[PDB]
Design an enzyme around this catalytic site. Structure first.
Site, mmCIF file in Angstrom:
data_model
loop_
_atom_site.group_PDB
_atom_site.id
_atom_site.type_symbol
_atom_site.label_atom_id
_atom_site.label_comp_id
_atom_site.label_asym_id
_atom_site.label_seq_id
_atom_site.Cartn_x
_atom_site.Cartn_y
_atom_site.Cartn_z
ATOM 1 N N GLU A 1 0.824 -1.201 0.000
ATOM 2 C CA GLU A 1 0.000 0.000 0.000
ATOM 3 C C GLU A 1 0.863 1.257 0.000
ATOM 4 O O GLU A 1 0.527 2.245 -0.662
ATOM 5 C CB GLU A 1 -0.940 -0.029 1.204
ATOM 6 C CG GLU A 1 -2.087 0.953 1.140
ATOM 7 C CD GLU A 1 -3.189 0.588 2.112
ATOM 8 O OE1 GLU A 1 -2.988 0.805 3.325
ATOM 9 O OE2 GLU A 1 -4.229 0.060 1.668
ATOM 10 N N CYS B 1 -12.032 8.453 3.756
ATOM 11 C CA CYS B 1 -12.198 8.182 5.184
ATOM 12 C C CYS B 1 -11.366 9.107 6.067
ATOM 13 O O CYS B 1 -11.806 9.454 7.169
ATOM 14 C CB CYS B 1 -11.856 6.716 5.487
ATOM 15 S SG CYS B 1 -13.064 5.527 4.766
ATOM 16 N N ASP C 1 -3.600 2.242 8.343
ATOM 17 C CA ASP C 1 -3.571 3.703 8.385
ATOM 18 C C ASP C 1 -2.577 4.213 9.415
ATOM 19 O O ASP C 1 -1.931 5.247 9.194
ATOM 20 C CB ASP C 1 -4.972 4.253 8.670
ATOM 21 C CG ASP C 1 -5.931 3.996 7.523
ATOM 22 O OD1 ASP C 1 -5.440 3.771 6.396
ATOM 23 O OD2 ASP C 1 -7.160 4.014 7.745
#
Lengths: 246, 246
Positions: A60, A148, A179
Site C-alpha cells: 500500500e 475516510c 492507516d
C-alpha cells in the site's frame, strides 16, 4: 488532550464492552458492526486487534508513493476490497499518497512542510485529504469511495511533532493498522525533512492522536474482539478460534 | 468516545494548569498563548470562559445565512478582527453559512441531509468546511483566513444525532462560544429537517463533541483563566479583575 487521551488498550476495552452488550449497528451492506462514536485516543500501539501484515502495508505504501488513482497499480494482485470499491475504469479516491503529494490536491505535504519550516509554532500546519466536492465524487463512475481520512494536522511543541489524525470512519482491524503505519510514515518523513532543513531544529516524532467519527468492527471480526475479551490475546487465527462468533 | 469524553469543566481545569505552570507558546503575532493540543471534549456547556453575548452571535448567524464572503455584510459595524483578516477587497474565507449552504462549496448541508435521510446509520453524513486549496486560498488578495473548522460529521445512534466537530484551531474565549452556538444551530436544524421529512424518525439532538488541534487562550484573556482558577467564576469584567495578568 495529547497528555492523557485514551490508550489503545482502553479502546479495546470499550469495543469489548460494546460486543458484550450487543451494541449493534447495521452496516451500509446490512451486516452488524460495533462502534466507538467520536473516538479519540493516542495511538500508543500500532494495531488494535489482528495480526501484523508488514507485507501488505508495504504494498500500500508503494501504491501511495505512485500517487495512482487506479487500484490495479497496487503492487501484485490487487485486494478484492479495492477491486470492489473501484469505478468502472478501476479508479478510486483514497490514494493517500495522491492526497498529500499530488499537485492536483494542492501540494498538502509540501505546503505543510513550508508552513512549519517558517513558523514552528504554527497552528496552520495541516494536510487536507478530503474535499468539499467529495459529496459528489465518492461515487464517480460507480466507485464507492468517500474519503475516510479528513485532515491530519501537525503541531510542534517542545521539539516534538504531534499528529492529530481526523477520520470520519475507520475499520478497527485492517483499517487502523494500515492507516497507523501510513500516518507514522508521514510523521517520520516530516520530522526528517524539517531536521534536514535546519540542524538547529532537532525535532523528534511526538504522539499520533486518532480521532474517528465511527471507529468500528464488522461482524466478520467479532471473533477477534471476543477472543481478546476472554484471554487478553489481541490475535487468533480464525481456524483456532473457539467461541460464539464462528 | 461520546460516552465519556472530557467535559468543559475539565477543559477549564487543564487550561488553568497550563497557565499556572506557565506552559506558554508564542503566537503568529508574537503574543503568548496557552493551549490544549489535540483537545477532545463533549461541549456540555455553551462557553468555557467569558460572558454571554447573544447579540454578537445573532449578527454572525445572519451573516452566515447571507453566505457572503465579505466582512462588511456582517450586520452593523463589522468587528475589528474581521476587518483585520479581510482581503484588500474586504473578502474572507470563513463564512460558515457559505461553507455549508453555498453551491460553490458543493451543498454540504443538503448532501449530508440527503445522505442521512436515505441511510440513518450512515458514516458518510458530513459537512466539509475546509478544502485542499486552502493551502493557497488562506491569503488570497492579502486576507489572513485559513479556515479553522475542518469538518463536522453527523452520526445518528439511538435516535440521537451526534455532531463530531473537527477544528484545527479554536480560541477558547470568543471562538468556542460563537462556534458552539453555530454548531448547535446547525444540529438543531438538521434534526428538525430530518424529522419534518418523516414523522417515524423521531430524532433528537445528541452530543456535540469538540475536537481541536490547538484549543488556545491568548494572553489578553489570561485574566479570565486566572480569575476562574482562584474563584470558580467563569467570567469577570476586565475592570473588576485584580491579579497578575493586568
Amino acid at each position: 488532550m495529547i497528555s492523557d487521551s485514551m490508550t489503545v488498550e482502553e479502546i479495546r476495552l470499550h469495543l469489548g464492552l460494546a460486543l458484550k452488550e450487543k451494541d449493534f449497528v447495521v452496516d451500509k451492506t446490512g451486516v452488524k458492526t460495533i462502534e466507538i462514536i467520536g473516538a479519540s485516543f493516542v495511538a500508543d500501539e500500532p494495531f488494535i486487534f489482528g495480526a501484523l501484515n508488514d507485507e501488505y502495508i508495504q504494498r500500500e505504501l508503494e501504491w501511495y508513493k505512485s500517487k495512482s488513482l487506479f487500484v490495479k497499480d497496487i503492487p501484485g494482485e490487487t485486494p478484492k476490497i479495492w477491486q470492489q470499491v473501484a469505478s468502472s475504469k478501476g479508479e478510486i479516491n483514497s490514494n493517500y499518497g495522491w492526497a498529500i503529494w499530488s499537485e492536483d490536491n494542492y501540494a498538502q505535504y509540501d505546503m505543510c512542510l513550508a508552513e512549519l519550516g517558517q513558523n514552528p509554532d504554527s497552528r496552520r500546519g495541516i494536510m487536507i485529504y478530503t474535499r468539499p466536492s467529495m459529496q459528489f465524487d465518492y461515487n464517480k463512475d460507480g466507485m464507492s469511495d468517500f474519503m475516510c481520512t479528513n485532515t491530519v494536522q501537525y503541531l510542534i511543541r517542545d521539539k516534538k511533532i504531534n499528529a492529530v489524525v481526523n477520520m470520519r470512519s475507520n475499520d478497527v482491524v485492517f483499517g487502523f493498522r494500515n492507516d497507523y503505519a501510513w500516518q507514522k510514515y508521514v510523521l517520520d518523513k516530516l520530522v526528517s525533512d524539517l531536521n534536514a532543513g535546519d540542524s538547529t531544529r532537532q525535532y523528534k516524532a511526538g504522539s499520533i492522536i486518532w480521532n474517528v467519527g465511527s471507529l468500528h468492527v464488522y461482524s466478520r471480526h467479532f471473533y477477534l474482539v471476543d477472543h481478546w475479551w476472554k484471554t487478553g490475546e489481541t490475535h487468533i487465527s480464525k481456524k483456532d478460534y473457539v467461541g460464539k462468533y464462528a
